[PDB]
């Protein structure tokens, strides 16, 4: 039993024995309605800022919620970046373009740092401690101990309200490929099951699930919204809809200022 | 009934079937990921409300979704190329998410009673071997979910025998295929070079095998240029008028 999920201030998180009970039946009644219903629901859709404008006009609000949004690119493209950013501005209004909600940050790389969430917290005028109280930071060694988190997410997500699940490279644990072959299948298996468990998630709790993917020079469901993220040239960074069931391949501009995600400074 | 055939947007494509979907039986639409599926399907559900004359249907669609991914943006983008009022486009669409085989199985049920009471010409089953394909860890059930995808199949045919609607159902490709059984048409939509997407008919017991190419452009499918309840679902069809 390793450490399970603690909040960015380093206080640990206590769940009731009600919400394992009530979860346990997770991961094994609508009818037909109009088109211009599920239209209005859908006009409904709490959707998350990310700091910069063009970002937001690029996805027509920010990232969804209820959906994966799976950003994908090279070292140092700006996914962590951006998750952290996220993780603060989910906490915001809904008038200012938050969620209203808690943020919750599986690192497997081990690059969360609690002072840009201060930082971008400042930036959007927030309580630093109070932004760091509502972000629940959990640590992944291996693929089982990144499930068992999951699991403790979906205990979590029961009792207090949450908007945003980050798991910064969800395929960190897996991409440790040095066996030859026979693990192939069995690691697609877990990060299919990982996927599918955090689809799960985002349908039941309606929760932004933003994953990051690195990519050196998976199986997204239909349903995926996909950026992957480049560096132009400069401060510059382009961020293009890979794939999208409402939006087109476009592109948009964004850079990394200290106080977190925001437009190119020209 | 006589059958309509119901245009596909695309004139390669509609002279591919010598006028478009054809009604009564079931069409097969399978293909890789990224090769037009969904956005056929939202380009159907609309075009199969238009007047006969114009290759439509005249009767209401009804969209079964399994993935997530049905966007009535795209209903309207394709109402207004074809100069509809977005209205009456998106009151003449019943839509349905679908998360197990079983509620996939129950809402035909609810579908017959709706096609009984109001006039539907379209029911699109988006991805119908999404929740059949969970494959998952039992990779070989085999017949404990064989019997249960041949029922809905029966039920298929049974809805377009009856009510002589046009049965469009997606199928993901990377004991008998009783898909391939109970499909009368089946279009294979692959990717070739660039926005090339290529439609074949892979199997047709009066069209020939032959290909067709297309295009998806803003504004839908396009040729390139060289328990269970309803609400206001239940209402008839409504023709949609032309706001333009
Ligand atoms: N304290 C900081 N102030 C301003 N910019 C920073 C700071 N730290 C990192 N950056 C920018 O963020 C980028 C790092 O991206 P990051 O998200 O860590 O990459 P990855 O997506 O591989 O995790 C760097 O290019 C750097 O310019
Ligand atoms: N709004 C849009 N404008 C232009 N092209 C689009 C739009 N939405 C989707 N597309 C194109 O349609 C394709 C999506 O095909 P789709 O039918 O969703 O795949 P599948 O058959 O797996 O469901 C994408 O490759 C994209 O280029
Ligand atoms: F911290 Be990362 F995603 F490289
Ligand atoms: F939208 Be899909 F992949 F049918």
Redesign the pocket.
Known sequence: TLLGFHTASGKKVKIAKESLDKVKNLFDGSGFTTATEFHQRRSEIIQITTGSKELDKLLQGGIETGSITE?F????????????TLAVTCQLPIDRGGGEGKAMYIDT?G?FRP??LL?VAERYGLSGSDVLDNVAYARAFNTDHQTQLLYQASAMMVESRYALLIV??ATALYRTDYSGRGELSARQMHLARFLRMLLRLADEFGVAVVI?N?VVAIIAHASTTRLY?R?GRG?T?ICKIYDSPSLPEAEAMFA????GVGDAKD
């Not at 690119?73 to 952290?84: A, D, L, M, P, W």
């Not at 990394?256 to 106080?259: F, G, P, S, Y």
């Open positions: 950003m690119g090279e070292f140092r493209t700006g996914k962590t970046q951006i998750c952290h790389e690059t002072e840009r930082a910064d490279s990051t690195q993220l560096k401060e960074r990394i200022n200290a106080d």
